[PDB]
Amino acid sequence: ILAERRKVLAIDHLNEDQLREKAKELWQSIYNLEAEKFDLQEKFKQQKYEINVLRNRINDNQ
Amino acid sequence: ISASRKLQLKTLLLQIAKQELEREAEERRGEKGRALSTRCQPLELAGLGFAELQDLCRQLHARVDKVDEERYDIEAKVTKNITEIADLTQKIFDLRGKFKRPTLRRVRISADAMMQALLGARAKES
Amino acid sequence: DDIYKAAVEQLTEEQKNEFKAAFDIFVLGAEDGCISTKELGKVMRMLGQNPTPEELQEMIDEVDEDGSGTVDFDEFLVMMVRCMKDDSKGKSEEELSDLFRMFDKNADGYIDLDELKIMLQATGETITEDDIEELMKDGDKNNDGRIDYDEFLEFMKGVE
Amino acid sequence: DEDETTALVCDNGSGLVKAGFAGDDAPRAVFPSIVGRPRHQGVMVGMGQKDSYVGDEAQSKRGILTLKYPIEHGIITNWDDMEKIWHHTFYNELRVAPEEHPTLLTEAPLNPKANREKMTQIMFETFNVPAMYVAIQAVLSLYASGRTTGIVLDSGDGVTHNVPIYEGYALPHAIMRLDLAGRDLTDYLMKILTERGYSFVTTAEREIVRDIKEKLCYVALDFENEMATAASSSSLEKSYELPDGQVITIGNERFRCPETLFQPSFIGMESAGIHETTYNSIMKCDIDIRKDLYANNVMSGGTTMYPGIADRMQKEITALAPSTMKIKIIAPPERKYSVWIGGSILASLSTFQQMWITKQEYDEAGPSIVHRKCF
Amino acid sequence: DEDETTALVCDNGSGLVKAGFAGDDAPRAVFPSIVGRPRHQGVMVGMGQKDSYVGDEAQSKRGILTLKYPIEHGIITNWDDMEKIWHHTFYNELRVAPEEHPTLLTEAPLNPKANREKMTQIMFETFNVPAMYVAIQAVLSLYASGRTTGIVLDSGDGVTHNVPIYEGYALPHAIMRLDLAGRDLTDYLMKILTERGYSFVTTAEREIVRDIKEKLCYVALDFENEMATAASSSSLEKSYELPDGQVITIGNERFRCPETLFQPSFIGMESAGIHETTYNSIMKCDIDIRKDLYANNVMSGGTTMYPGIADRMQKEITALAPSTMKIKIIAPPERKYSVWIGGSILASLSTFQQMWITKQEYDEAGPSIVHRKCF
Amino acid sequence: LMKILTERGYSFVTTAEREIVRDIKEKLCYVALDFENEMATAASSSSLEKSYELPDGQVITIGNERFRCPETLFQPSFIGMESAGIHETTYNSIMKCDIDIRKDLYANNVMSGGTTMYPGIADRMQKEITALAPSTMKIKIIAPPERKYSVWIGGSILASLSTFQQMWITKQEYDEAGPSIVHRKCF
């Protein structure tokens, strides 16, 4: 699954400028991956927070 | 405390909590887009020769792979915490619940057409 | 009952005079002229529905602003603004968690009286520590001195 | 007449059908499980008069009708009369069209399979209901009572089911279904009243004896002591008004009839009674189950309203149960109707919206599908 | 939650798992080594109810569960269930993340190799623990007891290991290992109580018998005299309350079960018994070792809490031992809770920081590293 | 069987009814060596149903229920019992014996008592044990016609053996010792 993000690579037949292109779309996919990661971080701080919430409830309401 | 007093109190409380979750989130998101543009930096392609730009495509996919790994770890943790969210969520929806499912009381039916067809020409109330 | 009396406030009062005339009608079948439990049965068959001595008496309780054991005229306004299912968004684990993130400003899990006073002062509307503390209690059924999220649900149950 | 596209609920026994919508705490109306037909020669022309009467119509014109009940001992055999009762129930009094609403029906788990198959077929083929679900009366009773665990004695008109449920699970090896119900208590009373000089044999008379039982009878906490005085003095007698101005006065028969619940031999049945069934449903379960079932005996349905029954049952089971252990009975005021309420609760739960047979799955499989989809 | 990356200590046996952190005096929580699963069909919907239960959850909901132990005779045969037990141990009750703490696990010296290898793999792969160590039960008992020399007789639920240690070194040729344990005594008690009219054949029944054993059973100092009286008079019977209110009394069976430790033939085992194997562990060591092992018989593990066991073990070996010499037993109130205690001590020693396997060496070698680095 | 026949529309709840079901079981039921394929067909076709005449002249037909009942011996969960069933219990008794015993017991599983008269039971048991048993080894079942009557037949044999004439409690030893004597003289 990392490998469907460790996609196979093609650089040689890519002309210098075609290299610029594929590297650019790769960096776009990178930016998307950073977006995913950061939204997972925000969702995840919300997760950790509201699970602290959860256990607070667990204790106060066992 | 007055009636509409407490009304506006509670509704503005909940809307404020909404919009402020959204404000922490928009600052979170500024943080996001900035850090994305940094750790996934606006690119630099040219100058590197054919072989060099080949290495460049290869390493930009390698960075695909790194952020792959990063977001993958984060989403695995997010999956575990979604799991735990739902787990303690129902656990407590029992703890403070087992009935936190409210009811639909029999007095709570629609009476509009009732008032109307009953009052006829004077169809006023509901 | 401040929600029904706020509706009274937030709505027009000529509907309330209308319900006064309807309550004058609610002397019919009323050995009391008012709407008691039995009189709520007869007023509702005069109104179209028919709640139960528990439902009638509980609407009484649900209109017992004063605790008058009846549905008074003011309590009948409460009734007319009280006999349906409308309070929306059902803010719960998901939505009151979205909220509790700020209710519990702490990013921890407890709306203490400071969290609650801060959230209220953020509401923009007028804020009293009577407000903050009554809402603390509405929370503090577990009585943590600080509204837990379960306290938050005993507090903001359905309220929107 | 109704303001929501909710599920419909109909609890169809050998006595009466309780019907209304999911989300309420009461049926909109109760329709007796009866289709009536005239048993006399007509003489007047142009004065109306129906060929058949359904539900409340059958009782209203009963003076000259023979009244038949489509359901026997918990199951439907006269499917045609059931469809007519339902058409009336849904369209004239509940004011609904099942085509636009999913429907929940009930049965006892130890009833014959044909019941759930025919009820499912009628709603899908004559009413075009979008979905169906046949429920367990014990489940519905536990939802209504606020429990996940207990022994449910549902007091039917046909049969009594007697099932232990623990933590939401069935414990089927311990179900003690008993062939004793309200219609047998009624038959016993017709015979005991014959001993007193009042013969009740025709439909109108049979309906009266049922009504007598409902208003005058009780079980008593202590049968022998109650009979010692009931059999000795007029001070324990009660008079019932027959609908012609005459009265019938009933003494120890007032409790000897309901006593059949504790003594089924009164109607020729081989059984030690409803407290034996309750006890064995607990006893046949594992010892780490038994403690929760002893503390949660659940009364549901009719007969649970008899004076002395909740106290008598708790006494009768604690007498068979081991010492130290706490034996307890749950018997809410939502008597004779709590199972309907349970129907309403289940039909409207979010946890139940995946339990429905849809009018796709039904059309592809046919009515045998109910056996795979409901329970 | 700790102010140091203290090792976590988890004494995972075939009975209960005792867990807490290194440097403390006691485990934070104890858990049955159990994963439970329902043996019934669910009837009510929206009841929660898990597919599987872990530890104390499995025991608390046992009324309808079949309960399995992933560890048999000291070895994990089911590591998927141990992942669940450890998840529960660490995240639900100790509420710690092993990812930030070294973890110490325990086993007998001749425990088949798969046990320590799978324990190492689970902690490094599912918990991603920074370090691991699998420790010897006898070593852990010796630290807890304040000794470097003695016989560790560890008669717990799984196996009796019985290994002589001198100056902190194994004397492996003298390990008088025996396939006789507390679990066999439990099985024997279920059978002997069945003979008294109280059958114990299901999971719920097995957990009850284990509880009966722990509170009512003993070995005594003199079996034949104890039975001469127990078999002749009710004065030596002791009662026990079962969860459903039943009361069971046990007479000579109260000690005849436990006696199997000294007389293994009672359950069909071919063995000299734990006291002869204790004696031989001393005898099979060199003559200049024997004197120190005779003076230091170290009692640990389960079954050590039977009345008469410490007194009896010293009597039985001193009776086989030569005259003039003094033979002594060490049996502190820390008996059986010595393996966990030793884990806390060992994990915390500065010299033990050279024994821990890190999540570095692990990746190059894989879980087989445990056989190169632990013992 | 009383409960599953109730599902079919023939309730059996009284003493007379219990005796009828026992008679039905004894004459109509079988276990089948392969119950899964047998029920796939028996539950689908009336061609595998057998008619039984009830005492009053009424007729009950039984299909997959015919074997479903005996199957409980291999599927004890059908009656709420926490058990592996008779084939695994037999296997475990073999397993629990010493390794030089196990082979002789695998080769000598002996049927006695009742229910061992069901068609397919000798094959059902031998195949289930064989499936649980190790390879190379031959697993075998002995199923004599002295089935169900075998305990009585053994009593005749044992009572008559010369090596068993010293095993009898006399009506002297009995009175001197009382009934607890059975624990010293019989086994």
Looking at the fold, whether D192 and D256 belong to one and the same domain comes out as yes
Q: Where are the alpha helices (DSSP H) in chain D?
A: 56-60, 79-88, 114-125, 137-145, 182-195, 203-216, 223-230, 253-256, 274-283, 287-294, 309-318, 338-347, 361-365, 370-373
Does any CB of chain A come closer than 8 Å to the CB of residue B31? Answer: yes
Beta-carbon neighbour count of residue A43 at 10 Å?
17
At E138, list the tokens.
């006898």
Looking at the fold, whether E75 and E61 belong to one and the same domain comes out as no
Reported resolution, Å = 8.1
Distance from CA of D112 to the nearest CA of F (A): 4
Residues of D in contact with E246 (CB under 8 A): 287, 322
DSSP secondary structure of A11-44: -SSS-HHHHHHHHHHHHHHHHHHHHHHHHHHHHH
> Least CA distance to E242: which residue of chain D?
D287
Q: Which CATH number belongs to the domain containing residue D64 in this structure?
A: 2.30.36.70
In terms of DSSP bridges, do strands F109-110 and F141-142 run parallel, antiparallel, or are they unpaired?
parallel
For chain C, the residues before each gap (C–N > 2.5 Å) are none
Choose the closest CB to C83 out of B8, B108, B124: B108
Domain with D45, as residue range(s), is 35-68
Q: How many residues does chain B have?
A: 126
Rounded CA separation E342/E107 (Å)? 12
φ, ψ of residue E153 in degrees (nearest 5): -105, 105
Rounded CA separation D138/F26 (Å)? 34
Contact D103, D7 (CB under 8 A): yes
Looking at the fold, whether E232 and E367 belong to one and the same domain comes out as no
Residues of B in contact with C125 (CB under 8 A): 5, 8-9, 12
Does any CB of chain C come closer than 8 Å to the CB of residue B98? Answer: no
**Tokens 């060929």 belong to which residue?**
D51
Edge-to-edge strand list for the sheet holding E329-330: E169-170, E163-166, E150-153, E297-299, E329-330
Tell me the longest C-alpha to C-alpha distance in chain B: 89
User: If phi over 0 gives left and psi between -120 and 50 gives alpha, with beta otherwise, what is residue D283?
Assistant: alpha
Residues of C in contact with B16 (CB under 8 A): 102, 119, 122-124
Does any CB of chain F come closer than 8 Å to the CB of residue E203? Answer: yes
Beta-carbon neighbour count of residue B91 at 10 Å?
19
> Do D3 and B109 lie within an 8 Å CB cutoff?
yes
Residue D364 burial (CB < 10 Å; 0-12/13-18/19+)?
A: exposed
Question: Which B-chain residues 85-124 have CB contacts (< 8 A) with chain D?
Answer: 99, 101, 104-106, 109-110
- Name E10's bridge partners: E19, E105
> Hey, which chains touch E, using 3+ CB pairs under 8 Å?
D, F
Does any CB of chain E come closer than 8 Å to the CB of residue D287? Answer: yes
Rounded CA separation D266/D258 (Å)? 10
Contact C144, C137 (CB under 8 A): no
Q: Which CATH number belongs to the domain containing residue D300 in this structure?
A: 3.30.420.40
Contact D66, D34 (CB under 8 A): no
Looking at the fold, whether D297 and D166 belong to one and the same domain comes out as yes
> Do A40 and B55 lie within an 8 Å CB cutoff?
no
Angle at F165 between CA F161 and CA F167, to 5 degrees: 110
Rounded CA separation D85/D18 (Å)? 11
Distance from CA of A36 to the nearest CA of C (A): 20
Contact E339, E9 (CB under 8 A): no
DSSP secondary structure of C120-131: HHHH-S---HHH
Q: How far is CA B8 from the centre of its chain?
A: 24
Looking at the fold, whether D223 and D79 belong to one and the same domain comes out as no
- Name D24's bridge partners: D22
At D270, list the tokens.
């081989």
Nearest to D114 by CA among D356, D358, D368, D362: D368
Instruction: For residue C69, give the 3-state DSSP assignment.
Output: coil
Rounded CA separation F56/F59 (Å)? 9
Residues 6+ apart with CB under 8 A from D122: D79, D82, D83, D86
SS3 of E49-78: the string is CCCCEECHHHHHCHHHEEEECCEECCEECC
Dihedral (CA of F126, F130, F131, F133) sign = positive
User: If phi over 0 gives left and psi between -120 and 50 gives alpha, with beta otherwise, what is residue D167?
Assistant: left
Rounded CA separation D329/D287 (Å)? 19
Does any CB of chain D come closer than 8 Å to the CB of residue E201? Answer: no
At E288, list the tokens.
């200049």
Residue D42 burial (CB < 10 Å; 0-12/13-18/19+)?
A: exposed
Beta-carbon neighbour count of residue D335 at 10 Å?
18
Distance from CA of B114 to the nearest CA of D (A): 9
Q: How far is CA D11 from the centre of its chain?
A: 8
Looking at the fold, whether D39 and D52 belong to one and the same domain comes out as yes
Contacts 24+ apart (CB under 8 A), E17-20: E17/E55, E17/E85, E17/E89, E18/E337, E18/E339, E18/E340, E19/E89, E19/E90, E19/E93, E19/E94, E19/E340, E20/E94, E20/E340, E20/E344
> Do B1 and C130 lie within an 8 Å CB cutoff?
yes
- Name D163's bridge partners: D152
Nearest to D345 by CA among C158, C35, E16, B101: B101
DSSP secondary structure of E167-224: TTEE-GGG---BS--HHHHHHHHHHHHHTTT----SHHHHHHHHHHHHHH----S-HH
Looking at the fold, whether E308 and E364 belong to one and the same domain comes out as no
> Least CA distance to B51: which residue of chain A?
A12
Q: How far is CA E300 from the centre of its chain?
A: 9
Nearest to F28 by CA among F44, F42, F43, F49: F49
Choose the closest CB to E64 out of D139, D169, D321: D169
Looking at the fold, whether E242 and E323 belong to one and the same domain comes out as no
> Do D113 and F80 lie within an 8 Å CB cutoff?
no
- Name D282's bridge partners: none
Looking at the fold, whether D140 and D229 belong to one and the same domain comes out as no
Q: Which CATH number belongs to the domain containing residue D196 in this structure?
A: 3.90.640.10
Rounded CA separation D325/E176 (Å)? 48
Residue F68 burial (CB < 10 Å; 0-12/13-18/19+)?
A: buried
Question: How much of chain D is helix, strand and coil, in % rounded to 5?
Answer: 40, 20, 40
At D61, list the tokens.
């014109």
Rounded CA separation E98/E79 (Å)? 17
Rounded CA separation B72/A34 (Å)? 11
Rounded CA separation B65/A27 (Å)? 11
Looking at the fold, whether D154 and D50 belong to one and the same domain comes out as no
Question: CA B83 → CA A43, B86, B87, distances in Å?
Answer: 13, 5, 6
Does any CB of chain F come closer than 8 Å to the CB of residue E39? Answer: yes
Beta-carbon neighbour count of residue E305 at 10 Å?
16
Distance from CA of F7 to the nearest CA of D (A): 4
Contact D22, D96 (CB under 8 A): no
Distance from CA of F9 to the nearest CA of D (A): 5
Looking at the fold, whether D226 and D79 belong to one and the same domain comes out as no
> Do C2 and B8 lie within an 8 Å CB cutoff?
no
Does any CB of chain C come closer than 8 Å to the CB of residue B12? Answer: yes
Question: Which D-chain residues 4-43 have CB contacts (< 8 A) with chain B?
Answer: 23-26
Nearest to E303 by CA among E136, E116, E169, E178: E178
Instruction: For residue D68, give the 3-state DSSP assignment.
Output: strand
Residue D221 burial (CB < 10 Å; 0-12/13-18/19+)?
A: middle
Q: How far is CA A11 from the centre of its chain?
A: 24
H/E element, A52: helix A16-60
Rounded CA separation F92/D351 (Å)? 42
φ, ψ of residue E252 in degrees (nearest 5): -75, -10
DSSP secondary structure of chain F: -HHHHHHTT----SHHHHHHHHHHHHHH----S-HHHHHHHHTT-GGG-EEEE-TTS-EEEESTHHHHTGGGGT-GGGGT-----HHHHHHHHHHTS-HHHHHHHHT-EE--SSSTTSTTHHHHHHHHHHHHSPSSSPP-EE--TTTTTHHHHHHHHHHT-GGGTTSPPPTTHHHHH-GGGHHHHT-
Residues 6+ apart with CB under 8 A from E209: E186, E189, E190, E193, E200
> Do B110 and D3 lie within an 8 Å CB cutoff?
yes
Which of B26, B48, B64 has the highest number of chain A CBs within 10 A, making it the mutation to test binding with A?
Answer: B64
Domain boundary among D215, D247, D267: D267
Looking at the fold, whether E96 and E18 belong to one and the same domain comes out as yes
Question: Which D-chain residues 299-338 have CB contacts (< 8 A) with chain B?
Answer: none
Nearest to C16 by CA among C77, C75, C80: C77
Q: How many domains does chain E have?
A: 4
How does DSSP classify residue B121?
G
At E252, list the tokens.
């000579």
Does any CB of chain E come closer than 8 Å to the CB of residue D133? Answer: no
